[PDB]
Design a binder for this molecule. Structure first.
Ligand code: MSG
Length: 288
């Protein structure tokens, strides 16, 4: 909402259209380590956030941040490499501006990915978790991307989030994981957003556990929210880049400056999976 005016999203949308002969259908937001999806595209046309009209520029991780328009597995994409984060100082209305613009680009689906810690013991690092739901902690406190005057032009005042993670795409994804014959069934669970750049303490992991979160991370929830607000089909996965220590026999460390699951091929499986899934994302054509 706030900070930008509808014409900002307009201007930015039209500029992007008047600058890429591409017209996307699926918008993909790559989390840390899953930036590689950008190589799978063809017809790729790269834009640095910086150069696009009202697009939040990166603060430091620019060296991982640009918008790549291409084609992935028979689907016109618009990939966002290096998403924005609240912990980077971005107000949420900047963190989600891209989703808003995507929609105006004709985008009707958003697949959000991210790297998260494994709250659920079942999770093995490297596990890919289909996001079934989310606990939007900063949202409970007011840090919700929709705070401010609602633009009935993008959507309602009180969007329903109960149905955020497209049930359809989740069934398809669980199937496709199977069709691929991967063995380890695509994990699935609730994702809990938590801001602040620092990592959870043991006692905090336990509340995230209690609350019912399966994987903890610092992004995605606001994009899922302004996406649904616009009526974008949304589904996503989180790459369990590590397991959070629930007991005080902590020791073990797993910074971004580590990120080794995503600092490895675990992330590669997610990229290909997401690529395969382009084939299960309904076309705007429908065509019977
Ligand atoms: C697994 N680990 C990775 N992230 C996310 O990846 C980027 C770098 O860590 C960061 O942007 C971050 O979102 C994690 N996030 C949380 N809340 N907890 C853990 S244990 C965690």
């Amino acid at each position: 909402e706030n900070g930008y005016t509808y014409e900002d999203y307009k201007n930015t949308a039209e500029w992007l259209l008047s600058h890429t002969k591409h017209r996307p259908q699926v918008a993909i937001i790559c989390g840390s380590g899953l930036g590689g999806l950008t190589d799978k595209l063809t017809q790729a046309q790269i834009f640095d956030y910086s150069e696009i009209p009202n697009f939040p520029r990166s603060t430091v991780p620019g060296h991982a941040g640009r918008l790549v328009f291409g084609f992935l597995n028979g689907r016109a994409c618009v990939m966002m490499q290096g998403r924005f984060h609240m912990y980077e100082g971005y107000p949420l209305w900047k963190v989600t501006f891209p989703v808003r613009v995507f929609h105006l680009l004709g985008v009707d689906t958003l697949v959000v990915t991210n790297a998260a810690g494994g709250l659920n013991p079942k999770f093995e690092v490297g596990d890919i978790m289909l996001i079934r739901d989310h606990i939007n902690l900063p949202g409970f406190s007011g840090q919700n991307p929709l705070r401010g005057p609602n633009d009935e032009r993008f959507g309602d005042r009180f969007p329903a989030m109960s149905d955020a993670y497209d049930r359809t795409m989740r069934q398809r994804a669980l199937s496709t994981w199977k069709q691929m014959g991967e063995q380890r069934e695509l994990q699935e669970g609730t994702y809990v957003m938590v801001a602040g750049p620092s990592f959870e303490t043991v006692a905090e992991c336990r509340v995230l556990q209690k609350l019912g979160a399966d994987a903890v991370g610092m992004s995605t929830v606001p994009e899922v929210i302004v996406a649904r607000h616009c009526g974008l089909r949304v589904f996503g996965f989180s790459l369990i880049t590590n397991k959070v220590i629930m007991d005080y026999e902590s020791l073990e460390k797993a910074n971004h400056e580590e990120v080794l699951a995503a600092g490895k091929q675990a992330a590669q499986k997610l990229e290909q999976f997401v690529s395969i899934l382009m084939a299960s994302i309904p076309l705007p054509d429908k065509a019977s």
